[PDB]
Enzyme design. Structure first.
Site, PDB file in Angstrom:
ATOM      1  N   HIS A 291       0.814  -1.220   0.000  1.00 48.91           N
ATOM      2  CA  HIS A 291       0.000   0.000   0.000  1.00 48.91           C
ATOM      3  C   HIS A 291       0.849   1.272   0.000  1.00 48.91           C
ATOM      4  O   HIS A 291       1.637   1.512   0.926  1.00 48.91           O
ATOM      5  CB  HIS A 291      -0.927  -0.022   1.226  1.00 48.91           C
ATOM      6  CG  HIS A 291      -1.864   1.137   1.294  1.00 48.91           C
ATOM      7  ND1 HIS A 291      -2.455   1.678   0.176  1.00 48.91           N
ATOM      8  CD2 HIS A 291      -2.313   1.859   2.350  1.00 48.91           C
ATOM      9  CE1 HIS A 291      -3.229   2.687   0.537  1.00 48.91           C
ATOM     10  NE2 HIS A 291      -3.164   2.817   1.848  1.00 48.91           N
TER      11      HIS A 291
ATOM     12  N   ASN B  39      -3.313   8.926   4.082  1.00 53.03           N
ATOM     13  CA  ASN B  39      -3.834   7.794   3.334  1.00 53.03           C
ATOM     14  C   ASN B  39      -4.726   8.318   2.213  1.00 53.03           C
ATOM     15  O   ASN B  39      -4.944   9.541   2.090  1.00 53.03           O
ATOM     16  CB  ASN B  39      -4.620   6.862   4.268  1.00 53.03           C
ATOM     17  CG  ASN B  39      -4.787   5.459   3.701  1.00 53.03           C
ATOM     18  OD1 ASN B  39      -4.444   5.186   2.541  1.00 53.03           O
ATOM     19  ND2 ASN B  39      -5.323   4.559   4.519  1.00 53.03           N
TER      20      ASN B  39
HETATM   21  C1  LIG Z   1      -2.852   0.415  -2.640  1.00 52.56           C
HETATM   22  C2  LIG Z   1      -3.515  -0.005  -3.975  1.00 52.56           C
HETATM   23  O1  LIG Z   1      -4.538   0.479  -4.332  1.00 52.56           O
HETATM   24  C3  LIG Z   1      -2.854  -1.039  -4.831  1.00 52.56           C
HETATM   25  C4  LIG Z   1      -3.697  -2.439  -5.044  1.00 52.56           C
HETATM   26  C5  LIG Z   1      -4.155  -2.930  -3.670  1.00 52.56           C
HETATM   27  C6  LIG Z   1      -5.424  -2.610  -3.231  1.00 52.56           C
HETATM   28  C7  LIG Z   1      -5.832  -3.013  -1.984  1.00 52.56           C
HETATM   29  C8  LIG Z   1      -4.956  -3.753  -1.169  1.00 52.56           C
HETATM   30  O2  LIG Z   1      -5.349  -4.152   0.092  1.00 52.56           O
HETATM   31  C9  LIG Z   1      -5.343  -3.273   1.201  1.00 52.56           C
HETATM   32  C10 LIG Z   1      -5.422  -4.098   2.417  1.00 52.56           C
HETATM   33  C11 LIG Z   1      -4.074  -2.433   1.286  1.00 52.56           C
HETATM   34  C12 LIG Z   1      -6.566  -2.338   1.161  1.00 52.56           C
HETATM   35  C13 LIG Z   1      -3.684  -4.059  -1.608  1.00 52.56           C
HETATM   36  C14 LIG Z   1      -3.261  -3.651  -2.859  1.00 52.56           C
HETATM   37  N1  LIG Z   1      -1.430  -1.450  -4.336  1.00 52.56           N
HETATM   38  C15 LIG Z   1      -0.338  -1.128  -5.166  1.00 52.56           C
HETATM   39  O3  LIG Z   1      -0.530  -0.609  -6.293  1.00 52.56           O
HETATM   40  C16 LIG Z   1       1.025  -1.479  -4.680  1.00 52.56           C
HETATM   41  C17 LIG Z   1       1.606  -0.276  -3.901  1.00 52.56           C
HETATM   42  C18 LIG Z   1       3.118  -0.353  -3.647  1.00 52.56           C
HETATM   43  C19 LIG Z   1       3.631  -1.422  -2.911  1.00 52.56           C
HETATM   44  C20 LIG Z   1       4.975  -1.491  -2.676  1.00 52.56           C
HETATM   45  C21 LIG Z   1       5.875  -0.441  -3.190  1.00 52.56           C
HETATM   46  C22 LIG Z   1       5.361   0.594  -3.890  1.00 52.56           C
HETATM   47  C23 LIG Z   1       3.981   0.673  -4.141  1.00 52.56           C
HETATM   48  N2  LIG Z   1       1.867  -1.702  -5.784  1.00 52.56           N
HETATM   49  C24 LIG Z   1       1.776  -3.002  -6.333  1.00 52.56           C
HETATM   50  O4  LIG Z   1       1.050  -3.894  -5.871  1.00 52.56           O
HETATM   51  O5  LIG Z   1       2.487  -3.218  -7.320  1.00 52.56           O
HETATM   52  C25 LIG Z   1       2.481  -4.465  -7.978  1.00 52.56           C
HETATM   53  C26 LIG Z   1       3.245  -4.327  -9.306  1.00 52.56           C
HETATM   54  C27 LIG Z   1       4.517  -4.938  -9.444  1.00 52.56           C
HETATM   55  C28 LIG Z   1       5.217  -4.755 -10.639  1.00 52.56           C
HETATM   56  C29 LIG Z   1       4.661  -3.968 -11.652  1.00 52.56           C
HETATM   57  C30 LIG Z   1       3.418  -3.372 -11.500  1.00 52.56           C
HETATM   58  C31 LIG Z   1       2.698  -3.553 -10.298  1.00 52.56           C
END
Ligand SMILES: *CC(=O)[C@H](Cc1ccc(OC(C)(C)C)cc1)NC(=O)[C@H](Cc1ccccc1)NC(=O)OCc1ccccc1
Length: 221
Positions: free
Chosen positions: A164, A188
């Site tokens: 997240h 957030n």
């Molecule tokens: C936060 C987000 O909206 C997204 C997708 C998501 C939604 C909900 C959840 O669950 C809760 C519990 C958090 C509500 C989980 C994920 N998350 C991302 O886009 C994520 C954010 C991130 C994470 C680590 C470092 C930087 C950013 N990024 C992600 O999942 O990336 C995956 C990916 C890997 C390689 C290429 C593209 C995408």
């Protein structure tokens, strides 16, 4: 080093809490948040930036729209593309649509980004000196989904599987709390009805709780 408390909201660096809705675009809100701060540092003007622009348009950099993405990829898109549109000009729809970027409506740019060393000390220095910092946390916990008040600590949190993207806008300590009393002030993107008006105080200096220092970065302007 650094001040004992920092809150960039008091200096005009931070837009109000937004709401990503039913779209996995947290990465885009973290990125617009960091870029909003850095553009304000540079120009003295705070202009809300378009997450939809990032969702629709940063596929070439590696992002996956409402399915997820990375703040650094967003910073890279802004650089490659030569701009990013304002929130007002390119409003958030919480779904995927055709990329509708219009340079005439661009209100921000960057020259790349800086990845912070994976230590809370380095994150502290970055926050104190640079402004709001994009970070990723392990938010995959009922305790986090239902967070309301206090300094967030989740015994089962991990520093390795962050899911997240959020924004650190400062840090402090609670005259109340003291033993493990420091917190990161985190903006957030789940609307104002979550947490403390959309913010959460995350445990600080407890060995990188929830991986908050493990994926920290900011755009270079
Ligand atoms: C936060 C987000 O909206 C997204 C997708 C998501 C939604 C909900 C959840 O669950 C809760 C519990 C958090 C509500 C989980 C994920 N998350 C991302 O886009 C994520 C954010 C991130 C994470 C680590 C470092 C930087 C950013 N990024 C992600 O999942 O990336 C995956 C990916 C890997 C390689 C290429 C593209 C995408």
């Amino acid at each position: 080093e650094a001040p004992r408390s920092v809150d960039w909201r008091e200096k005009g660096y931070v837009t109000p809490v937004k709401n990503q809705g039913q779209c996995g675009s947290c990465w885009a809100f973290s990125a617009t948040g960091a870029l909003e701060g850095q553009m304000f540092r540079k120009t003295g003007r705070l202009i809300s930036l378009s997450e939809q622009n990032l969702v629709d348009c940063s596929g070439p950099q590696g992002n996956e729209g409402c399915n997820g993405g990375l703040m650094d990829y967003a910073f890279q898109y802004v650089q490659d593309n030569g701009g990013l549109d304002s929130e007002e000009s390119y409003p958030y729809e919480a779904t995927e649509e055709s990329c509708k970027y219009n340079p005439k409506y661009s209100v921000a740019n960057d020259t790349g980004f800086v990845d912070i060393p994976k230590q809370e000390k380095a994150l502290m220095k970055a926050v104190a000196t640079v402004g709001p910092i994009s970070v990723a946390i392990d938010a995959g916990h009922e305790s986090f989904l239902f967070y309301k008040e206090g300094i967030y600590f989740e015994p089962d949190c991990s520093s390795e599987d962050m899911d997240h993207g959020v924004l650190v806008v400062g840090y402090g300590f609670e005259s109340t709390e003291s033993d493990n009393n420091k917190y990161w002030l985190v903006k957030n993107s789940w609307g104002e009805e979550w947490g403390m008006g959309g913010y959460v105080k995350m445990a600080k200096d407890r060995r990188n709780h929830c991986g908050i220092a493990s994926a920290a970065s900011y755009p270079t302007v």
